[PDB]
Amino acid sequence: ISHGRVFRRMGLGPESRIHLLRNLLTGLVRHERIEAPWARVDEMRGYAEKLIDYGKLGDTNERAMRMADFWLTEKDLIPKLFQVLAPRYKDQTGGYTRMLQIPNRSLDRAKMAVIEYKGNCLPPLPLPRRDSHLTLLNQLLQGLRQDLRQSQ
Amino acid sequence: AIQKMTRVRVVDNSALGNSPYHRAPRCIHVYKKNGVGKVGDQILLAIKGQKKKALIVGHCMPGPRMTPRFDSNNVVLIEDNGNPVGTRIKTPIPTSLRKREGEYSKVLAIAQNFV
Amino acid sequence: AAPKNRRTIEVNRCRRRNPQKLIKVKNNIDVCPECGHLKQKHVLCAYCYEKVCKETAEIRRQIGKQEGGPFKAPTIETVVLYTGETPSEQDQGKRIIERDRKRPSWFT
RNA sequence: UCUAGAGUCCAUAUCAACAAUAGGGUUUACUGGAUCAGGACAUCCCGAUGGUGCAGCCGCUAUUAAAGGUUCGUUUGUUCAACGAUUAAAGUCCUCGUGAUCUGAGUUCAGACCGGAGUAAUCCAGGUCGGUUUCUAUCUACUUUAUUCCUCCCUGUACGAAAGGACAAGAGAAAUAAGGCCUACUUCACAAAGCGCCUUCUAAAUGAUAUCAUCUCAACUUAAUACCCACACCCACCCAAGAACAGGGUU
RNA sequence: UAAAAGGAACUCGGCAAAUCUUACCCCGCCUGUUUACCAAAAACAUCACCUCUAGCAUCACCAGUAUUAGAGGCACCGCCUCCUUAAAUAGGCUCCACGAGGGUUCAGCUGUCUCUUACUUUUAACCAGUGAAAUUGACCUGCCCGUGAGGCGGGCAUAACACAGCAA
RNA sequence: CUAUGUAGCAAAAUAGUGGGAAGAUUUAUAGGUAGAGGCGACAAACCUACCGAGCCUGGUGAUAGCUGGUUGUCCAAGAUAGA
RNA sequence: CGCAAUAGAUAUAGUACCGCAAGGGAAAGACAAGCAUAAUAUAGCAAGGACUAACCCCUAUACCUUCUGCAUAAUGAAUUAACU
Numbered sequence A: 001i002s003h004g005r006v007f008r009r010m011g012l013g014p015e016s017r018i019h020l021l022r023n024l025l026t027g028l029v030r031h032e033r034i035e036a037p038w039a040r041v042d043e044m045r046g047y048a049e050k051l052i053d054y055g056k057l058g059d060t061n062e063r064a065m066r067m068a069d070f071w072l073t074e075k076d077l078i079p080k081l082f083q084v085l086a087p088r089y090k091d092q093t094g095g096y097t098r099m100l101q102i103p104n105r106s107l108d109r110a111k112m113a114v115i116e117y118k119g120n121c122l123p124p125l126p127l128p129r130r131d132s133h134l135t136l137l138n139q140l141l142q143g144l145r146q147d148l149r150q151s152q
Numbered sequence B: 001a002i003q004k005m006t007r008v009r010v011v012d013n014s015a016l017g018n019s020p021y022h023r024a025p026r027c028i029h030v031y032k033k034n035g036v037g038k039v040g041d042q043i044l045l046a047i048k049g050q051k052k053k054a055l056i057v058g059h060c061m062p063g064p065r066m067t068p069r070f071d072s073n074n075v076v077l078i079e080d081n082g083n084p085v086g087t088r089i090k091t092p093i094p095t096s097l098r099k100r101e102g103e104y105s106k107v108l109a110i111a112q113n114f115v
Numbered sequence C: 001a002a003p004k005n006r007r008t009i010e011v012n013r014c015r016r017r018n019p020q021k022l023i024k025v026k027n028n029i030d031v032c033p034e035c036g037h038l039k040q041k042h043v044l045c046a047y048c049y050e051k052v053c054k055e056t057a058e059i060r061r062q063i064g065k066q067e068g069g070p071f072k073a074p075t076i077e078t079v080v081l082y083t084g085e086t087p088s089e090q091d092q093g094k095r096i097i098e099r100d101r102k103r104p105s106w107f108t
Numbered sequence D: 001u002c003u004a005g006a007g008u009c010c011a012u013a014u015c016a017a018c019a020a021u022a023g024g025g026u027u028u029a030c031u032g033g034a035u036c037a038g039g040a041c042a043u044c045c046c047g048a049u050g051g052u053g054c055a056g057c058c059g060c061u062a063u064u065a066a067a068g069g070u071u072c073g074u075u076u077g078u079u080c081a082a083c084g085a086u087u088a089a090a091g092u093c094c095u096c097g098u099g100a101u102c103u104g105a106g107u108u109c110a111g112a113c114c115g116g117a118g119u120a121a122u123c124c125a126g127g128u129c130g131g132u133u134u135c136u137a138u139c140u141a142c143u144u145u146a147u148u149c150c151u152c153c154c155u156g157u158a159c160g161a162a163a164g165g166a167c168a169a170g171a172g173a174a175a176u177a178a179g180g181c182c183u184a185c186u187u188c189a190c191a192a193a194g195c196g197c198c199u200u201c202u203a204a205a206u207g208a209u210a211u212c213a214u215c216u217c218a219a220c221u222u223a224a225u226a227c228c229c230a231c232a233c234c235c236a237c238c239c240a241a242g243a244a245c246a247g248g249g250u251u
Numbered sequence E: 001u002a003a004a005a006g007g008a009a010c011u012c013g014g015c016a017a018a019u020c021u022u023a024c025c026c027c028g029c030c031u032g033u034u035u036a037c038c039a040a041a042a043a044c045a046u047c048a049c050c051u052c053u054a055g056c057a058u059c060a061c062c063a064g065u066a067u068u069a070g071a072g073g074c075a076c077c078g079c080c081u082c083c084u085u086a087a088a089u090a091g092g093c094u095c096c097a098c099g100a101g102g103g104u105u106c107a108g109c110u111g112u113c114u115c116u117u118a119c120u121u122u123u124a125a126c127c128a129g130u131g132a133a134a135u136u137g138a139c140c141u142g143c144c145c146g147u148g149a150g151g152c153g154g155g156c157a158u159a160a161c162a163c164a165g166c167a168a
Numbered sequence F: 001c002u003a004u005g006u007a008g009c010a011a012a013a014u015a016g017u018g019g020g021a022a023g024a025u026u027u028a029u030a031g032g033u034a035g036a037g038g039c040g041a042c043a044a045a046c047c048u049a050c051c052g053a054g055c056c057u058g059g060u061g062a063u064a065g066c067u068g069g070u071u072g073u074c075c076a077a078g079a080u081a082g083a
Numbered sequence G: 001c002g003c004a005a006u007a008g009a010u011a012u013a014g015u016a017c018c019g020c021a022a023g024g025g026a027a028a029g030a031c032a033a034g035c036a037u038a039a040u041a042u043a044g045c046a047a048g049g050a051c052u053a054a055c056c057c058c059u060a061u062a063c064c065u066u067c068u069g070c071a072u073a074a075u076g077a078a079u080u081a082a083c084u
Ligand SMILES: [Mg+2]
Pocket: A010, A011
């Protein structure tokens, strides 16, 4: 039975789980885009979001500083968190990271995933667009837009 | 949960009990179909190498909400025909003995304090 | 325990070729409508993703060559500029990572 | 089965001696326990009925009844027996029932000691201490078919020779079993659980063979619903659904 | 790893675990040695004591000589040649010290148990790679009753097929 | 002593709990004792994984009143006193 | 009226490899079974009588060896090829 347990089980125990997610999160803050196994990235996305939330409070706060000290291992990144990432998202109140699935890994055929922090300098991921607005179904729906707007 | 093989401290001034003895009183039987005994369930005790009927008047096991949860498994010695052997009780006894039927009227006429 | 009798080729064929053990035909493949390569719906075009990772790696090699050694995460944003692209009016005060090939058409 | 002998009178209220008719074994001298239990009734309890010498609950025997239940411990292990406390009860047997589910004692493994027999080696259907049986499931089969007790009214009527003391009908309280839940307590903490909570449905009347009579292997007349239930999808994500597959949701 | 109340009611036995105390009894004096791979012991050895044999050269005893050497028995030393439990088939020549020896008891402790529960790790189930072995007459491999049992007889049942369990 | 493991990591291990740990201790190195023999704080203990008597070659194709086997077609006669 | 690559020497070799050692001691070179093409459909020693028809109907207690006969009471055999 596992009803209502939101935390995956990975590594050699709870502690190794936190440490694995910590290394993933450090790599993400250092490079702003990493390809990792899908389940691990899905577990780490929440932590990266809340890390940006803690980083918005700013250097002066001590709780946020302790948290970013634990969750960043090469400390050169703590400046970045408080001076490049958190400032970058002064407008967005949520959803700072985008997560996609990518071709499975060559060796062990695992389910992969690229995760990145929105707005970085890197070449943009090939996001999937929706169908062009000029397609047949969209045109008929646009006609319905007009005809319903005039009636109402 | 006053079941078989549990130590209970007699609190009734115990004309019989309360005297030194290397053993301590133990419950050897509970007069309920199942073993567990709750308040008012009269049990049997091996005290001073003798067998004597008892009556539970408090236990460390949490009960319902509005009834007391003592910290010692308290018992009153009662004679076979229901008469309490002692003549006094000092430790508080719960007011949850005026409830569900049993030989409890005498045991309240002999105590002095409630909770 | 151990088997009491060999199992015949007939029983083994009714097990091995049962549908539950067959490989299912995938109903979710298609063609990248613009790029024109195969892809699953919920996954990135493999060829496009590879051509993106190549450029990301080249950019990162330049970044490493400029930062010198480890422990040098800058405290400012970064912008990457290809040949014949002066730093725009918005990118002053941001580190520049020069590259020596024409900007890819897919890089916006 | 004959009652024949008894029983303060009297075989039938009880033993019922011999025998007869029935079902069943007797091998030594000249295999338990845990786990799960399937089944019979020759019934321990609960249920229904007859007689009683029970004038009455209970007792006694007799018929019927196998849906349900049939406790925990001290000493010990040819497996029983004794003893304490209870209980409505602690039933008699078949399938050690069950060791590719687990354990112990043994009886028969090498070590050693004590007692008996022997010149000795050694024996002993003796007593002690110690002591290793491994298994990845191929096939079959299978994996979602409410009782009891106590208390109280009804009261101490009938029954009853005094004395004691009923049914039918209800109302509370507890446990157990099945099924389910997490508001509180408890172990814990997006949840799973119990020590907690909730629900459980053979005596008569008429009457012939035999005109009275006679309960009739005479005719003839009387003493479970509930639950499930939408033909045609399945890429992706989530899930109180889940081993995979399935199932619920994506407004 | 954690655990409500109870704390040995488990069990052959407090084995395991948690906690740290006490008292006695049997055997053996003690440290030691032993059945490499089921027995570590109450067996062997052991100081102490006793008995038997032996008057002596250059390869052991021994470059030794009766207070010596070899072979045996025994095992220092001193002393002689009714209670327990509620209940009980269990426990209760002197002789300190010691024992992973055997039996019993007090107190504590605890998931041993009343009565199980949660979480973690490995295993596990699925995807991908590599890939055994015992076993195997053939099998198109059902149930009940009888005979003497998947296969015979008489009844019953019965569309095919994976996957995970269980152990009649 | 318990649990895991039982084609196992291992033809006797692993984890914990344990006995000894200045001695009759433990141990590296070369030599010696050789099979009815050696050695043995006797357990029939050990002498290269299997010792109430090593291992290899030879006599040896040991012997076996015991077990197991014994190969084309077709026909015909064919069975239970006893010493 | 000797063998022709499981024979003939053990031999391509006393090599490889096993053993501390004595010692042991190989293999080989020039459309059989198993599968795929093509999974299965009530029922049962898997066949026979048949039938228009594959199944359906009726009949039908595997083989060797050992015990007086053995329902498989027990022993032996996964199966092909070569040698026996
Ligand atoms: Mg893992």
